Design a protein around this ligand. Structure first.
Ligand SMILES: OC[C@H]1O[C@H](O[C@H]2[C@H](O)[C@@H](O)[C@@H](O)O[C@@H]2CO)[C@H](O)[C@@H](O)[C@@H]1O
Lengths: 393, 403
């Protein structure tokens, strides 16, 4: 890992080009080069390369993964002066608090919202139950009502948690490992409605992030569920869109998992002081955050002074309203195993491989024990191997 | 020819100078699969110029050359999203003759199928638009032409490859080929004609047969229910007979093992009752299946997918056919002389199969133990005698045979 440089990793759906602008300004004043990269499977790649002493100088991700990173000794302690800590909201400082120690700099609050096409759908629905009727009315013009990423549980979880589903119960001022609400009556009811949309052919089980984004941004589907990072591509497209509150399931609000984008410093980095100056004096300023927000919107930024310039944005207001009706993600190391189990459960329930009760039952056991059922059936291995044997021509 | 220069010719260039620019780029990069990140935006600009004319419609003069440039650029992840639009995928499907909506140039068809294979393989958006466009309908039909078709081997192979990619990646297309299009009957016919009873399968027929097997695996691995009718049973039995021929057949180019593996994997999806054709004493097929499995026991990282299908097939043959059960018992579990050496020690077949009974993978444990169990005629003390109690305990516990 090079010294005298700063290598930064941030997810590919974020403003990595905007972050490169902040690195240019950093090189202009100090003469230090800054490289921004967005590798695939970033949340898995960083543990494997940082545990060996490599990886980036600074790692960007939502706060939920940073506890497992800190528990493995992968993150260095950050030392923001009390004068700097007051420039950011305290609630975002909470999200990067692991064992009473600050492990990452918070950047911005994220939450899913209902994005809709004002031309195809001037009055967006307020409940999930009317979406089947709405998709019926929209199929008459070659369009559909709703499409969103069904390959990541983050996007399904708002419907799951609405009626009572939860991750780890917060009690006695702590998350307890063994209280998991993945297979209760509410999470079963939410996942069942999701599966019933797919059986009734209002949504396709194979829809991923890029398929959903492509459909909405080309005016094919009237609604999509996504976060602040997705507004730029909809701006660039010919779609006239609004960002509103998520629909209500069973008369209750959808509860999205609120994430706080955070920048962690690598323990193996020999530039822990340059990383501090870049994140405090360049990124977490009005100039640094605007450069990134101009690329892909961040949401409600942690820096007080610049959140004031964005708060009137009706899209930020809808992001916060959904954030208020949701739950701040835990950052316990068990979160990594929690997402792995719920990802398998959503896919299996949607694809019809398991029932709703089966998929959530297996996810509860794995999430309650911080274990990963790395199974894969024989027929699934054969297809994945036949696919892997196919190359380009 | 650099990407920026070739893109310049397409914009401000005469007909004869834009074709040479593409002609030279196709020569320099006909085998380019890695791309320099420096000229990334140059290639994306060139790719958007190629797609604009493709969406408008290419004149028949410059069609093979235009598609080859698109096929080369489709190998790059950065230029990928430029080619994955409805109009673009509709143009490629029309030029390939598989659009649902003019004579066909066989070179244009070949290049269009290759383009479609690249985009479908690489892009979920392309997979989604290909499902919407219903390409599988005309694809299966042309594949179903069989001896009625003078289509070249290349076109027939890339139809199957595109058929494999759609059915592997898209479950809606996979179910559409199985249910609406009756793909099992369609591909069983296509398999029957690709095989001809030659004692050696030529290289071309070997490629298409194995694609047919992999497509058949995609549409049968989780769609065939336990109880079928006699039409499906006669259909699956007939398909099983062709798989019996593959198991007994040799393939040119040292690909006989690759063909057998796909044949065995597809056998593992058929209804268990349809495996009787493997026997119609006469244990030539079982002997080949047994040594097929015996050679697969060396796989470590991919042991599961290598031995579970054939073991499951051997287990069902032994369970329903007494001469097969007894023949396999004589081959796998010969009568013991000295009962001192532990079953899980040694390099004999019985020793390799016993060690799998305590494998880490629960599928390998069940499949290996079930095999030796039925060879012991489901007798608990006979099962313990040959495999040892500690190794036998897993199966006996799962089946509630302790009491
Ligand atoms: O799907 C599970 C996934 O959810 C969250 O990931 C979000 C991320 O927070 C967003 O900023 C954006 O990148 O979308 C992601 C979902 O694809 C968790 O942060 C992540 O740990 C978890 O695996």
């Amino acid at each position: 890992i090079e010294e005298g440089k700063l290598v930064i990793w941030i997810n590919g759906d974020k403003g990595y080009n905007g972050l490169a602008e902040v690195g240019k300004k950093f090189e202009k004043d100090t003469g230090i080069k800054v490289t921004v990269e967005h590798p695939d499977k970033l949340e898995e790649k960083f543990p494997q390369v940082a545990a060996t002493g490599d990886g980036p100088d600074i790692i960007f991700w939502a706060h939920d993964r940073f506890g497992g990173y800190a528990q493995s000794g992968l993150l260095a302690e950050i030392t923001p002066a009390a004068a700097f800590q007051d420039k950011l909201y305290p609630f975002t400082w909470d999200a990067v608090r692991y064992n009473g120690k600050l492990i990452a700099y918070p950047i911005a609050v994220e939450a899913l919202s209902l994005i809709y096409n004002k031309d195809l759908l001037p009055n967006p629905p307020k409940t999930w139950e009317e979406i089947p009727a709405l998709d019926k009315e929209l199929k008459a013009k070659g369009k559909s009502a709703l499409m969103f990423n069904l390959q990541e549980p983050y996007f399904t979880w708002p419907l799951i948690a609405a009626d009572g589903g939860y991750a780890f119960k917060y009690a006695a001022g702590k998350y307890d490992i063994k209280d998991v609400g993945v297979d209760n009556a509410g999470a079963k009811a939410g996942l069942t409605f999701l599966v019933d949309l797919i059986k009734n052919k209002h949504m396709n089980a194979d829809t991923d992030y890029s398929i959903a984004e492509h459909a909405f941004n080309h005016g094919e589907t009237a609604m999509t569920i996504n976060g602040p990072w997705a507004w730029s591509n909809i701006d660039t497209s010919a779609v006239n869109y609004g960002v509103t509150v998520l629909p209500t399931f069973k008369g209750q609000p959808s509860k999205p998992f609120v994430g706080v984008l955070s920048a962690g410093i690598n323990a193996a980095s020999p530039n822990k002081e340059l990383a501090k100056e870049f994140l405090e004096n360049y990124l977490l300023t009005d100039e640094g955050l605007e450069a990134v927000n101009k690329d892909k919107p961040l949401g409600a930024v942690a820096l007080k002074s610049y959140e004031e310039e964005l708060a009137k944005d009706p899209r930020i207001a809808a992001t916060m309203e959904n954030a208020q009706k949701g739950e701040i993600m835990p950052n316990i190391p068990q979160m990594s195993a929690f997402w792995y189990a719920v990802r398998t459960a959503v896919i299996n329930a949607a694809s019809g491989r398991q029932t709703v009760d089966e998929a959530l039952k297996d996810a509860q056991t794995a999430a309650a024990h911080n274990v990963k059922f790395v199974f894969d059936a024989v027929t699934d291995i054969i297809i994945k191997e036949n696919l892997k044997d196919c190359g380009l021509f | 020819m650099e990407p920026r220069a070739v893109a310049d010719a397409l914009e401000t260039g005469e007909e004869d100078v834009v074709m040479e620019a593409l002609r030279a780029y196709n020569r320099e990069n006909s085998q380019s699969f890695t791309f320099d990140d420096a000229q990334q935006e140059d290639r994306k600009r060139l790719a958007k110029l190629l797609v604009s004319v493709l969406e408008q419609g290419l004149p028949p003069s410059r069609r093979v050359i235009w598609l080859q440039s698109i096929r080369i650029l489709s190998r790059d992840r950065s230029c990928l999203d430029s080619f994955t639009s409805r109009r673009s995928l509709q143009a490629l499907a029309c030029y390939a003759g598989i659009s649902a909506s003019e004579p066909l140039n066989m070179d244009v068809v070949l290049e269009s199928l290759k383009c479609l294979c690249n985009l479908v393989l690489s892009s979920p958006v392309a997979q989604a638009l290909a499902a919407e466009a219903g390409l599988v309908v005309r694809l299966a039909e042309r594949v179903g032409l069989c001896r009625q078709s003078s289509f070249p081997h290349d076109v027939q192979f890339f139809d199957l490859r595109l058929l494999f990619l759609l059915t592997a990646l898209r479950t809606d297309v996979r179910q559409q080929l199985f249910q609406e299009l009756q793909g099992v009957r369609l591909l069983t016919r296509a398999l029957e004609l690709t095989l001809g009873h030659p004692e050696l399968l030529p290289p071309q027929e070997t490629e298409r047969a194995m694609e047919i097997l992999k497509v058949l695996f995609n549409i049968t691995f989780d769609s065939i229910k336990r109880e079928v009718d006699e039409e499906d049973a006669a259909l699956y039995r007939h398909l099983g007979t062709l798989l019996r021929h593959c198991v007994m057949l040799a393939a040119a180019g040292d690909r006989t093992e690759e063909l057998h593996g796909h044949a065995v994997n597809l056998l593992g999806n058929l209804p268990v009752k349809c495996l009787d054709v493997l026997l119609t004493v006469n244990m030539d097929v079982i002997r080949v299946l047994l040594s097929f499995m015996e050679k697969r026991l060396h796989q470590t990282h991919r042991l599961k997918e290598s031995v579970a299908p054939v073991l499951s097939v051997l287990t069902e043959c032994a369970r329903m056919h007494r001469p097969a059960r007894k023949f396999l018992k004589a081959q796998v579990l010969p009568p013991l002389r000295d009962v001192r050496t532990r079953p899980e020690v040694g390099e004999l077949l019985r020793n390799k199969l016993v060690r799998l009974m305590t494998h880490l993978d629960t599928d390998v444990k069940r499949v290996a133990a079930e095999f030796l169990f039925v060879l012991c005629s489901e007798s608990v003390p006979r099962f313990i005698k040959y495999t040892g109690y500690g190794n036998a305990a897993g199966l006996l516990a799962a089946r509630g045979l302790m009491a």
